[PDB]
Amino acid sequence: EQASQEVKNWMTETLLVQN
C-alpha cells in the first residue's frame, strides 16, 4: 500500500514538507 487515505495524507503532507 504505497498510499491509503490516512497513509496518503501523512505520506504526502509529511514528505511534501520535507521535500
Add this chain to the structure above:
Amino acid sequence: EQASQEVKNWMTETLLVQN
C-alpha cells in the same frame, strides 16, 4: 515521528526493509 496501526505497519516494514 508518526505511526498508526496501518501506518505503523508500513512505516516499520517498508522502512525496515529499506534500512
